[PDB]
Amino acid sequence: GSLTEDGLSYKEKFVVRSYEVGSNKTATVETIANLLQEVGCNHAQSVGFSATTTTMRKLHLIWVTARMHIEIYKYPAWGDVVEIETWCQSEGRIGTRRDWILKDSVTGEVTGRATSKWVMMNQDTRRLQKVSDDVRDEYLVFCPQEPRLAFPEENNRSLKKIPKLEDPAQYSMIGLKPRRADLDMNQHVNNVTYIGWVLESIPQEIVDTHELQVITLDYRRECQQDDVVDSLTTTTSNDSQFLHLLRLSGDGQEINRGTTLWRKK
Amino acid sequence: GSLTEDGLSYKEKFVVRSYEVGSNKTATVETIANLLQEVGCNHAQSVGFSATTTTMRKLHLIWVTARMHIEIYKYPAWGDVVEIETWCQSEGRIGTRRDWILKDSVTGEVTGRATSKWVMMNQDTRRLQKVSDDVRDEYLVFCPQEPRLAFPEENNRSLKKIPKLEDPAQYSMIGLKPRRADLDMNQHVNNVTYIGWVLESIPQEIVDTHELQVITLDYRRECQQDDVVDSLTTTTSDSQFLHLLRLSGDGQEINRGTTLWRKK
Ligand SMILES: COc1ccc([C@H](N)c2ccccc2)cc1
Numbered sequence: 001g002s003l004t005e006d007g008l009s010y011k012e013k014f015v016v017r018s019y020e021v022g023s024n025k026t027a028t029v030e031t032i033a034n035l036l037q038e039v040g041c042n043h044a045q046s047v048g049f050s051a052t053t054t055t056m057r058k059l060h061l062i063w064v065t066a067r068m069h070i071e072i073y074k075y076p077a078w079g080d081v082v083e084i085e086t087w088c089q090s091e092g093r094i095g096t097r098r099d100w101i102l103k104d105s106v107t108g109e110v111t112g113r114a115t116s117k118w119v120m121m122n123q124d125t126r127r128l129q130k131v132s133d134d135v136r137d138e139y140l141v142f143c144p145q146e147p148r149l150a151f152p153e154e155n156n157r158s159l160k161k162i163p164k165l166e167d168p169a170q171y172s173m174i175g176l177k178p179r180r181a182d183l184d185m186n187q188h189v190n191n192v193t194y195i196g197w198v199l200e201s202i203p204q205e206i207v208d209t210h211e212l213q214v215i216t217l218d219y220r221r222e223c224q225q226d227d228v229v230d231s232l233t234t235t236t237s238n239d240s241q242f243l244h245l246l247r248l249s250g251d252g253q254e255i256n257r258g259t260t261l262w263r264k265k
Numbered sequence: 266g267s268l269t270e271d272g273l274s275y276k277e278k279f280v281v282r283s284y285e286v287g288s289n290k291t292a293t294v295e296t297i298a299n300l301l302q303e304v305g306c307n308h309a310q311s312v313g314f315s316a317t318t319t320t321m322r323k324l325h326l327i328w329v330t331a332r333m334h335i336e337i338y339k340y341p342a343w344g345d346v347v348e349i350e351t352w353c354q355s356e357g358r359i360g361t362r363r364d365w366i367l368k369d370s371v372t373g374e375v376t377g378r379a380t381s382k383w384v385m386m387n388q389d390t391r392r393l394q395k396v397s398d399d400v401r402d403e404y405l406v407f408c409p410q411e412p413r414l415a416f417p418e419e420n421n422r423s424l425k426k427i428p429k430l431e432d433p434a435q436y437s438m439i440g441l442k443p444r445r446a447d448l449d450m451n452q453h454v455n456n457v458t459y460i461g462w463v464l465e466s467i468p469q470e471i472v473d474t475h476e477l478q479v480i481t482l483d484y485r486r487e488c489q490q491d492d493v494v495d496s497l498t499t500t501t502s503d504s505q506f507l508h509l510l511r512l513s514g515d516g517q518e519i520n521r522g523t524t525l526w527r528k529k
C-alpha cells in the first residue's frame with residue numbers, strides 16, 4: 001500500500017483468501033471490516049504515527065469508535081483483488097471521521113464504501129474528551145482541508161439516530177463470549193467481533209436467501225474479556241430491515257445498538 | 266505465490282496484519298495455521314484443482330485432517346514478510362501428508378515448520394476409506410518421488426501417540442460455541458477454530474509469561490454448528506500440557522492434543 005500523490009489519503013490492494021469467504025465464495029462483511037481496520041492502521045503508520053499523536057500519548061488519550069457504517073454493492077470473490085482507499089477528516093471539537101472507498105481492481109468500479117466516527121477518551125478514567133485545538137493542528141496536516149465524504153448525500157443513512165430494541169426480541173443468540181482470537185494487540189475485544197455477534201441473531205434462512213447491503217453500528221460500552229453478551233434482533237420492515245441490540249447477559253447493560261439492510265438474492 | 270521450478274512444491278509471501286498479532290506484536294499460532302491452510306489451497310488451485318481430484322468427486326470422497334503438528338521458533342512480527350513453502354506426499358494406502366516450511370523473507374532463515382496427515386472420507390456416510398489406485402496416480406504427478414520431510418528425525422514428535430486426559434482436569438473453558446466467522450465456505454467449523462478452543466483452557470498467566478513452541482492436535486470428531494464444546498487442560502511437566510476437547514453434554518471426544526511452551 002501507499003499514500004496517494006497529494007499525501008492526503010492511503011490505498012492498498014488485498015487478495016481475498018480461502019478462509020475469508022462465506023458460503024457464496026465471496027468475502028464476509030467481517031472480512032471487509034478487518035480490511036478497513038488494516039488499511040486505516042497502515043495509513044497511520046505511513047504518516048509518522050504508532051494512532052495517537054505526541055500530545056495524546058502524553059495526556060493518556062486514545063481514539064475510540066462511536067459509530068461504523070458499511071455499505072456494500074458487490075462482495076469480492078475468493079481470489080479477487082480489492083483496492084481500498086482511506087482518508088481522515090476533523091469534524092470540529094466532536095472528533096474525527098475516517099472514510100473508505102472499496103473498488104474492484106480489474107474493472108475500477110466502486111463495490112463498497114464505509115464511514116466511521118471517532119471520539120477521544122482518557123485510557124484510564126474512560127471519560128470522553130472534546131478535541132483540544134493543539135491536537136487538531138497535529139493531524140490537520142494529514143487531512144484534506146475541503147470536505148471529502150464517502151457519503152455526501154443530504155440526509156444519508158450513515159447519520160441517522162438508532163432506536164433501542166424493546167423486549168421481547170424476535171430473535172436472539174445468548175451466551176456469546178470472546179476468545180483470545182477476538183482480542184487485538186492491546187487485549188481489547190476487536191471492533192469487528194461486535195459485528196459478528198450482531199449478525200449471530202439473524203436467522204440462518206435470511207443469511208442463506210439474502211445478502212447484506214448496509215450495516216450501521218453504534219458502540220456504547222466495551223465488552224471485557226470475561227463478559228458474556230446477548231445478541232437481540234427484530235425485523236422492522238423485496239428488502240428486509242432489522243433492529244439490533246448487544247447487551248450484557250447478566251444485568252442487561254447495553255454495549256451496542258445497530259441496524260442492517262438485506263436485499264433478496 | 267507460485268510453484269517452484271520443478272512444479273513439485275508451492276511458495277507464497279505473506280505480510281503480517283495488525284489484527285493477526287497478539288500482545289507481543291507477533292502473529293498468533295491461529296494466524297500461522299490460517300496461512301498454512303491458505304498456502305495449501307493455493308498449491309491445489311495452481312496444480313489443477315477447482316483438492317478432491319476428478320475420481321473423488323464421482324465417489325463423493327473428501328480429504329479430512331487426522332493430525333496437525335506445528336513447531337515455531339520465531340513468530341513473525343506485525344509488518345514482517347513470512348515466506349511459506351508447502352508440498353504433498355503419498356504415504357501408501359493410509360492417506361496423504363502435507364508439509365510446510367516457514368522462512369523469514371529478510372534473512373532467509375527457517376522460523377517454523379509444520380506437518381499434517383490426511384485420510385479419505387465419504388462425504389455422506391462419514392466412513393474413512395483407504396486410498397485406492399487411480400486416485401493415487403491422479404496426484405502422484407504433483408508430489409516428489411523421493412521422501413521430502415519437514416520433520417525427518419526417525420520417530421519424532423509429529424508421529425507420537427497422544428493419551429486421553431483423565432478427569433478431573435487441572436484447567437477448563439466450558440460452553441464454547443462456533444459463530445459464523447468460525448465456518449468455512451462449505452459451512453463446516455474450520456480446523457483452526459479447534460486450535461483456538463484448545464488454547465482457551467491454558468491460563469492467561471502461562472500465555473503472558475511463555476511462548477508456544479510446539480502444538481500437536483488429533484482430530485477425532487467434527488464439531489457441528491449447533492454443538493457446544495468443553496476445553497480441558499492438565500500440566501504434564503519448559504511447560505507441557507495435555508489437552509482434550511469434548512461435547513459439553515455427553516462428553517463425546519472431538520480432539521486430543523499436546524502443547525510445549527518455553528519461558529520468555
Ligand atoms: C462513544 O462510544 C463509546 C465510548 C466509550 C466506550 C468505552 N470502551 C467504555 C468502556 C466501558 C464502559 C463505558 C465505555 C465505548 C464506546
Ligand SMILES: COc1ccc([C@H](N)c2ccccc2)cc1
Pocket residue numbers: 329330331384386391484485486487
Ligand atoms: C481420522 O480423523 C477424523 C475422522 C473423521 C472426522 C469427521 N469430521 C467426523 C465427524 C463426525 C463424526 C465422526 C467423524 C474427523 C477426523
